[model samples]
Target: MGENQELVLSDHYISLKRYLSATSRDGNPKPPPNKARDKLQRLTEVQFLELSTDVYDELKRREQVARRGPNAPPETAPPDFLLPQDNFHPKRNQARQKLSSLGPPRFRDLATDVFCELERRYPNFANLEMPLNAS
Candidate 1:
């Protein structure tokens, strides 16, 4: 995928829209949005990690509040969503390439360390394949 392309989290966007629409309409039934499903096959593993990091951060923020109070609503302080860095994935790619050029083992070591730190921060969040190896 090119730099302009991205997999929109439509389920989330739609759910948010429906909730707001319901509150506005009072009794009208809201239909689900029929947008195209996002395709992600073109993304590299490192790119996927970038996406996962943002998701994990959001999940962690929600989990923190959920643990504090099970019934906390939008009014009781909202989820503190994490923002993607300005050069988030681009910088990551450059760093990955730099490390890969250094040597095989060093690159793998860096990758493993990154995955381990992410797993520690967002345990039970995403589907990490062969996390034992990644860690």
Candidate 2:
């Protein structure tokens, strides 16, 4: 069991490296592992889960669209996209203010259902494993 765990962790390390390399270079060079781990550690579990689900769903949606070929129906806005006056209310100033200040709704569609399965399977998946680098 220990060996299996090590093997899985090793694979994730390699995958993470590849993911980082292929990621857009719009920002500075990737930070050291310590910095990366530190940032991940700062996220509350709720925030971490939301971000992870968004990324996972986005990737799945893109792959589906790509596989559907050119005739695919226009892809719907991402599950995280802003809505038309989310929770707008004419009678309550508080509701209006809340709607105006919101960035985007997290649970805009059925993606939350998918994320629920992921959550059940990986409840402790708040951060990525930082594999040890051997000299």
Candidate 3:
């Protein structure tokens, strides 16, 4: 894909649109603005890390609260609904490269680490066999 081309998340995008359209919550076609199914995918690595840390902190707080039980100090929060950065495929990076560079040099390394973590967490993370040369 050309640098100017948008990264097509393919199945992920289709599935997202289907779920939102089916739910019709707050009305039909409720996918996130610009239909960006995974918010993290579109963000620079620095942006992704900021959101990721925020979510990690919130989840940690909830876990502590759960262990404490019934208000040692009340804490409640909702699930972080954004897609994890690691879920984005390296195949998509071709288009992403065209869009804009993601912050400083270390940002790419950070992104690579996140992707490795995801693959570790889910063995199937790298199952997609899309041809590297295929658009």
Measured by TM-score, the strongest candidate is 2
* Model 2: lDDT of residue 58: 42
TM-score of each model, paired residue for residue: 0.28, 0.32, 0.28
Q: Where is the poorest 10-residue window by lDDT in model 2?
A: 106-115
Q: For residues 1-135, what per-residue lDDT tens digits would candidate 1 score against the true structure?
A: 434221232322232233334334525332232311133435675676555444434334544755656565657654333333556576654543343344434433333333333334345423322212243
Off by over 4 Å in 2: 1-35, 71-135
**How much does each candidate deviate from the true structure in C-alpha RMSD?**
18.0, 12.5, 16.4
The residue pairs in collision within model 2 are none
Model 3 ranges with Cα > 4 A deviation: 1-35, 70-135
Clashes of each: 0, 0, 1
lDDT of each: 0.40, 0.40, 0.38
56-124, model 2: which lDDT tens digit per residue? 434444445456656655564232222334354344334333333443232222223223333344555
Provide the lDDT at 106 for model 2: 28
lDDT of 1 at 63: 49
- In angstroms, the error of model 2 at 61 is 1.0
Ranking by TM-score: 2, 3, 1
